[PDB]
Short mmCIF file of all heavy atoms in Angstrom, two decimals:
data_model
loop_
_atom_site.label_atom_id
_atom_site.label_comp_id
_atom_site.label_asym_id
_atom_site.label_seq_id
_atom_site.Cartn_x
_atom_site.Cartn_y
_atom_site.Cartn_z
N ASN A 22 79.94 49.20 36.46
CA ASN A 22 81.25 49.07 37.08
C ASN A 22 81.38 49.94 38.33
O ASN A 22 81.77 49.45 39.41
CB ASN A 22 82.35 49.42 36.08
CG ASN A 22 82.49 48.44 34.92
OD1 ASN A 22 83.29 48.66 34.02
ND2 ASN A 22 81.71 47.37 34.93
N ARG A 23 81.03 51.22 38.21
CA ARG A 23 81.10 52.16 39.32
C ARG A 23 80.27 51.67 40.50
O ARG A 23 80.70 51.74 41.66
CB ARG A 23 80.63 53.55 38.89
CG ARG A 23 80.82 54.64 39.95
CD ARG A 23 82.31 54.80 40.29
NE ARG A 23 82.52 55.88 41.26
CZ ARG A 23 83.72 56.22 41.74
NH1 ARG A 23 84.82 55.58 41.34
NH2 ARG A 23 83.84 57.22 42.61
N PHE A 24 79.08 51.14 40.21
CA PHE A 24 78.18 50.61 41.24
C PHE A 24 78.33 49.08 41.30
O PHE A 24 77.34 48.36 41.46
CB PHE A 24 76.73 51.01 40.95
CG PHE A 24 76.58 52.44 40.53
CD1 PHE A 24 76.00 52.75 39.32
CD2 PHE A 24 77.01 53.46 41.34
CE1 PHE A 24 75.85 54.06 38.92
CE2 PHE A 24 76.88 54.79 40.95
CZ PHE A 24 76.30 55.09 39.72
N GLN A 25 79.57 48.60 41.17
CA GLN A 25 79.88 47.17 41.20
C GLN A 25 79.19 46.49 42.39
O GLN A 25 78.49 45.49 42.22
CB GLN A 25 81.39 46.95 41.30
CG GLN A 25 81.91 45.87 40.37
CD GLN A 25 81.24 44.52 40.61
OE1 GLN A 25 81.33 43.96 41.71
NE2 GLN A 25 80.57 44.00 39.58
N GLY A 26 79.39 47.05 43.59
CA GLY A 26 78.77 46.50 44.78
C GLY A 26 77.51 47.26 45.15
O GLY A 26 77.20 47.42 46.33
N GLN A 27 76.79 47.75 44.13
CA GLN A 27 75.56 48.48 44.33
C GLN A 27 74.44 47.97 43.44
O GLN A 27 74.01 48.65 42.50
CB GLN A 27 75.79 49.97 44.03
CG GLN A 27 76.63 50.71 45.06
CD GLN A 27 76.02 50.69 46.46
OE1 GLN A 27 76.71 51.00 47.43
NE2 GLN A 27 74.73 50.37 46.58
N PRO A 28 73.94 46.75 43.72
CA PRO A 28 72.85 46.16 42.95
C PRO A 28 71.59 47.03 43.02
O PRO A 28 70.75 46.98 42.12
CB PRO A 28 72.61 44.80 43.64
CG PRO A 28 73.22 44.94 44.98
CD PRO A 28 74.38 45.88 44.82
N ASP A 29 71.49 47.84 44.07
CA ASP A 29 70.35 48.73 44.26
C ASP A 29 70.38 49.86 43.23
O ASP A 29 69.33 50.29 42.76
CB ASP A 29 70.36 49.32 45.67
CG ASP A 29 70.26 48.25 46.75
OD1 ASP A 29 69.25 47.52 46.79
OD2 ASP A 29 71.21 48.14 47.55
N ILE A 30 71.58 50.34 42.89
CA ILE A 30 71.73 51.41 41.92
C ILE A 30 71.45 50.95 40.51
O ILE A 30 70.68 51.55 39.78
CB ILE A 30 73.15 51.99 41.94
CG1 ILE A 30 73.49 52.47 43.35
CG2 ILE A 30 73.24 53.13 40.92
CD1 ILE A 30 74.89 53.00 43.46
N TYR A 31 72.12 49.86 40.13
CA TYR A 31 71.97 49.30 38.80
C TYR A 31 70.51 48.89 38.56
O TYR A 31 69.92 49.26 37.55
CB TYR A 31 72.89 48.09 38.63
CG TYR A 31 73.27 47.82 37.19
CD1 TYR A 31 73.87 48.81 36.40
CD2 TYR A 31 73.06 46.58 36.62
CE1 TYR A 31 74.24 48.54 35.10
CE2 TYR A 31 73.41 46.31 35.32
CZ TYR A 31 74.01 47.29 34.56
OH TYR A 31 74.37 47.02 33.26
N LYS A 32 69.94 48.15 39.51
CA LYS A 32 68.54 47.73 39.41
C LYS A 32 67.62 48.94 39.39
O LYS A 32 66.74 49.06 38.52
CB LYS A 32 68.16 46.81 40.57
CG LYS A 32 68.74 45.41 40.46
CD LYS A 32 68.16 44.67 39.26
CE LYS A 32 68.73 43.27 39.13
NZ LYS A 32 68.16 42.54 37.96
N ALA A 33 67.80 49.85 40.35
CA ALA A 33 66.98 51.07 40.45
C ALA A 33 67.06 51.89 39.17
O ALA A 33 66.03 52.23 38.60
CB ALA A 33 67.44 51.92 41.63
N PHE A 34 68.28 52.17 38.72
CA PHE A 34 68.50 52.95 37.48
C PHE A 34 67.68 52.38 36.34
O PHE A 34 66.96 53.12 35.65
CB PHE A 34 69.99 52.96 37.14
CG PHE A 34 70.36 53.82 35.97
CD1 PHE A 34 71.08 54.99 36.17
CD2 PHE A 34 69.99 53.48 34.68
CE1 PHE A 34 71.43 55.80 35.10
CE2 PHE A 34 70.33 54.27 33.61
CZ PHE A 34 71.06 55.44 33.82
N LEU A 35 67.77 51.08 36.12
CA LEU A 35 67.01 50.43 35.05
C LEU A 35 65.51 50.61 35.26
O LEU A 35 64.79 51.00 34.33
CB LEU A 35 67.37 48.93 34.96
CG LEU A 35 68.82 48.64 34.58
CD1 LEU A 35 69.04 47.14 34.47
CD2 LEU A 35 69.19 49.33 33.28
N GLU A 36 65.04 50.36 36.49
CA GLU A 36 63.62 50.54 36.83
C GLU A 36 63.19 51.98 36.60
O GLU A 36 62.05 52.23 36.19
CB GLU A 36 63.36 50.13 38.28
CG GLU A 36 63.60 48.66 38.57
CD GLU A 36 62.63 47.72 37.86
OE1 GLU A 36 61.71 48.21 37.17
OE2 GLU A 36 62.79 46.49 37.99
N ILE A 37 64.10 52.92 36.85
CA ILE A 37 63.84 54.34 36.65
C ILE A 37 63.44 54.62 35.21
O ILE A 37 62.39 55.19 34.93
CB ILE A 37 65.07 55.19 37.03
CG1 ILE A 37 65.31 55.12 38.55
CG2 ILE A 37 64.91 56.63 36.59
CD1 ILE A 37 66.63 55.72 38.97
N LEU A 38 64.30 54.17 34.30
CA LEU A 38 64.05 54.32 32.86
C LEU A 38 62.79 53.55 32.48
O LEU A 38 61.88 54.08 31.84
CB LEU A 38 65.24 53.78 32.06
CG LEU A 38 66.61 54.17 32.59
CD1 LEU A 38 67.70 53.55 31.75
CD2 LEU A 38 66.76 55.69 32.62
N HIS A 39 62.75 52.28 32.89
CA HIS A 39 61.61 51.40 32.61
C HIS A 39 60.29 51.99 33.11
O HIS A 39 59.25 51.80 32.47
CB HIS A 39 61.83 50.01 33.23
CG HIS A 39 62.76 49.15 32.45
ND1 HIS A 39 62.55 48.79 31.14
CD2 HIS A 39 63.93 48.55 32.81
CE1 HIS A 39 63.53 48.01 30.72
NE2 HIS A 39 64.38 47.85 31.72
N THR A 40 60.32 52.74 34.23
CA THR A 40 59.10 53.36 34.74
C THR A 40 58.58 54.32 33.67
O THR A 40 57.40 54.30 33.32
CB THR A 40 59.38 54.09 36.06
OG1 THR A 40 59.73 53.18 37.08
CG2 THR A 40 58.20 54.91 36.57
N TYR A 41 59.50 55.12 33.13
CA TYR A 41 59.22 56.07 32.07
C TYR A 41 58.65 55.36 30.84
O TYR A 41 57.57 55.72 30.36
CB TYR A 41 60.51 56.82 31.76
CG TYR A 41 60.43 57.80 30.60
CD1 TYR A 41 60.58 59.15 30.81
CD2 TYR A 41 60.22 57.35 29.31
CE1 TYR A 41 60.53 60.04 29.76
CE2 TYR A 41 60.17 58.23 28.26
CZ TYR A 41 60.32 59.58 28.48
OH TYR A 41 60.28 60.46 27.43
N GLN A 42 59.39 54.36 30.33
CA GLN A 42 58.97 53.61 29.13
C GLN A 42 57.60 52.92 29.32
O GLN A 42 56.79 52.92 28.39
CB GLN A 42 60.04 52.58 28.74
CG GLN A 42 60.24 51.50 29.76
CD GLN A 42 59.32 50.28 29.60
OE1 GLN A 42 59.37 49.37 30.43
NE2 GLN A 42 58.48 50.25 28.56
N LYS A 43 57.36 52.37 30.50
CA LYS A 43 56.09 51.69 30.78
C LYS A 43 54.89 52.62 30.67
O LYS A 43 53.90 52.29 30.03
CB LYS A 43 56.10 51.04 32.17
CG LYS A 43 57.01 49.84 32.30
CD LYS A 43 56.93 49.21 33.69
CE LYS A 43 57.31 50.21 34.78
NZ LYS A 43 57.14 49.64 36.14
N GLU A 44 54.98 53.79 31.31
CA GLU A 44 53.88 54.77 31.27
C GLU A 44 53.43 55.05 29.84
O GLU A 44 52.23 55.23 29.59
CB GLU A 44 54.28 56.06 31.99
CG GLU A 44 53.96 56.07 33.48
CD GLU A 44 54.66 54.98 34.27
OE1 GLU A 44 54.38 53.78 34.02
OE2 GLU A 44 55.48 55.32 35.14
N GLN A 45 54.37 55.04 28.89
CA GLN A 45 54.04 55.25 27.48
C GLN A 45 53.14 54.10 27.04
O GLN A 45 52.13 54.29 26.37
CB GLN A 45 55.29 55.27 26.61
CG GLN A 45 56.36 56.22 27.09
CD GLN A 45 57.49 56.39 26.09
OE1 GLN A 45 57.26 56.76 24.95
NE2 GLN A 45 58.71 56.11 26.52
N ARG A 46 53.54 52.90 27.46
CA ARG A 46 52.80 51.67 27.16
C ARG A 46 51.41 51.73 27.81
O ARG A 46 50.42 51.33 27.22
CB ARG A 46 53.57 50.45 27.71
CG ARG A 46 55.04 50.41 27.34
CD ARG A 46 55.27 49.93 25.93
NE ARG A 46 54.67 50.79 24.93
CZ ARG A 46 55.12 52.01 24.61
NH1 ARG A 46 56.24 52.49 25.16
NH2 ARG A 46 54.48 52.74 23.70
N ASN A 47 51.39 52.23 29.06
CA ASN A 47 50.15 52.37 29.81
C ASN A 47 49.11 53.18 29.05
O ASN A 47 47.97 52.74 28.89
CB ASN A 47 50.44 53.04 31.18
CG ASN A 47 51.09 52.08 32.16
OD1 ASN A 47 52.17 51.56 31.91
ND2 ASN A 47 50.43 51.85 33.29
N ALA A 48 49.51 54.35 28.56
CA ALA A 48 48.62 55.22 27.78
C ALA A 48 48.00 54.47 26.60
O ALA A 48 46.83 54.64 26.30
CB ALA A 48 49.37 56.46 27.31
N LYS A 49 48.82 53.66 25.93
CA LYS A 49 48.37 52.88 24.78
C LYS A 49 47.33 51.83 25.20
O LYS A 49 46.30 51.68 24.54
CB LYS A 49 49.55 52.19 24.11
CG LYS A 49 49.18 51.42 22.85
CD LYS A 49 48.68 52.34 21.74
CE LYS A 49 48.24 51.56 20.53
NZ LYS A 49 49.36 50.79 19.90
N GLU A 50 47.61 51.11 26.29
CA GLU A 50 46.71 50.07 26.80
C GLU A 50 45.36 50.65 27.20
O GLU A 50 44.32 49.99 27.04
CB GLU A 50 47.36 49.36 27.99
CG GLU A 50 48.64 48.62 27.65
CD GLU A 50 49.29 47.97 28.85
OE1 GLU A 50 48.67 47.09 29.46
OE2 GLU A 50 50.42 48.37 29.20
N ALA A 51 45.36 51.87 27.73
CA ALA A 51 44.13 52.53 28.16
C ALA A 51 43.23 52.91 26.96
O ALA A 51 42.05 53.19 27.14
CB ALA A 51 44.45 53.77 28.99
N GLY A 52 43.81 52.91 25.76
CA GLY A 52 43.05 53.27 24.57
C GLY A 52 43.31 54.69 24.10
O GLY A 52 43.07 55.01 22.93
N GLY A 53 43.80 55.55 25.00
CA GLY A 53 44.07 56.93 24.65
C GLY A 53 43.74 57.88 25.79
O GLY A 53 44.41 58.91 25.96
N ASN A 54 42.70 57.56 26.55
CA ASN A 54 42.26 58.40 27.67
C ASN A 54 43.10 58.11 28.93
O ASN A 54 42.57 57.64 29.94
CB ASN A 54 40.78 58.17 27.97
CG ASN A 54 39.91 58.43 26.75
OD1 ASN A 54 39.85 59.55 26.24
ND2 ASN A 54 39.21 57.40 26.29
N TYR A 55 44.40 58.39 28.85
CA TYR A 55 45.31 58.17 29.97
C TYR A 55 46.61 58.95 29.81
O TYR A 55 47.33 58.77 28.82
CB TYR A 55 45.65 56.67 30.10
CG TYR A 55 46.79 56.40 31.07
CD1 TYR A 55 46.53 56.07 32.40
CD2 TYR A 55 48.11 56.49 30.67
CE1 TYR A 55 47.57 55.85 33.30
CE2 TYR A 55 49.16 56.25 31.54
CZ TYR A 55 48.88 55.95 32.86
OH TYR A 55 49.91 55.71 33.74
N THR A 56 46.91 59.80 30.79
CA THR A 56 48.14 60.57 30.77
C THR A 56 49.23 59.82 31.54
O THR A 56 48.97 59.25 32.60
CB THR A 56 47.93 61.97 31.34
OG1 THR A 56 48.92 62.87 30.83
CG2 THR A 56 48.04 62.00 32.84
N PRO A 57 50.47 59.80 31.02
CA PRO A 57 51.58 59.11 31.66
C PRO A 57 51.99 59.73 33.00
O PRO A 57 51.88 60.94 33.20
CB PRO A 57 52.73 59.24 30.65
CG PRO A 57 52.05 59.61 29.38
CD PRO A 57 50.87 60.44 29.77
N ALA A 58 52.43 58.88 33.93
CA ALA A 58 52.82 59.33 35.26
C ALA A 58 54.34 59.52 35.39
O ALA A 58 54.88 59.49 36.49
CB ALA A 58 52.34 58.32 36.31
N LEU A 59 55.04 59.76 34.27
CA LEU A 59 56.47 59.98 34.27
C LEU A 59 56.92 60.77 33.05
O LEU A 59 56.25 60.83 32.02
CB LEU A 59 57.27 58.67 34.26
CG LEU A 59 58.06 58.33 35.51
CD1 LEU A 59 57.15 57.91 36.65
CD2 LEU A 59 59.09 57.27 35.21
N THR A 60 58.12 61.31 33.19
CA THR A 60 58.79 62.06 32.15
C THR A 60 60.29 61.96 32.39
O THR A 60 60.70 61.37 33.38
CB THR A 60 58.34 63.54 32.14
OG1 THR A 60 58.53 64.14 33.41
CG2 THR A 60 56.89 63.71 31.75
N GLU A 61 61.09 62.57 31.53
CA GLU A 61 62.54 62.53 31.75
C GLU A 61 62.86 63.08 33.15
O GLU A 61 63.89 62.76 33.73
CB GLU A 61 63.27 63.33 30.67
CG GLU A 61 63.04 62.80 29.25
CD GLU A 61 63.48 61.36 29.04
OE1 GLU A 61 63.98 60.72 29.99
OE2 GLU A 61 63.32 60.86 27.90
N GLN A 62 61.92 63.89 33.68
CA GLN A 62 62.06 64.48 35.01
C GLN A 62 62.07 63.40 36.09
O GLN A 62 62.88 63.48 37.01
CB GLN A 62 60.90 65.46 35.28
CG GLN A 62 60.87 66.64 34.32
CD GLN A 62 59.74 67.60 34.63
OE1 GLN A 62 59.68 68.20 35.70
NE2 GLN A 62 58.82 67.77 33.68
N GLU A 63 61.22 62.37 35.97
CA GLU A 63 61.19 61.30 36.96
C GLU A 63 62.45 60.44 36.80
O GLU A 63 63.03 59.98 37.78
CB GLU A 63 59.98 60.39 36.78
CG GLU A 63 58.63 61.04 37.05
CD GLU A 63 58.51 61.62 38.45
OE1 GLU A 63 59.23 62.60 38.75
OE2 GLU A 63 57.72 61.09 39.25
#
């Protein structure tokens, strides 16, 4: 609502979280020898 006319914020925000969630997935796909490129910090 706050970013009603801000598709960049809503989209970005989601991608921000998703970036974090994906890296977890990435480590799994690698088999184990892979450190994630994100944290709550990113």
Side-chain angles (χ1 to χ4, degrees):
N22 292 177
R23 187 61 178 179
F24 316 122
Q25 224 303 299
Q27 287 301 164
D29 300 298
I30 304 178
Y31 205 56
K32 286 295 180 179
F34 185 110
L35 296 182
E36 295 294 357
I37 292 170
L38 316 178
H39 282 301
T40 294
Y41 176 115
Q42 65 88 183
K43 289 183 301 176
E44 271 61 295
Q45 309 189 57
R46 312 281 62 72
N47 284 60
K49 183 65 183 298
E50 297 177 63
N54 303 298
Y55 170 94
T56 204
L59 248 73
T60 55
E61 300 300 0
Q62 299 181 62
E63 294 303 67

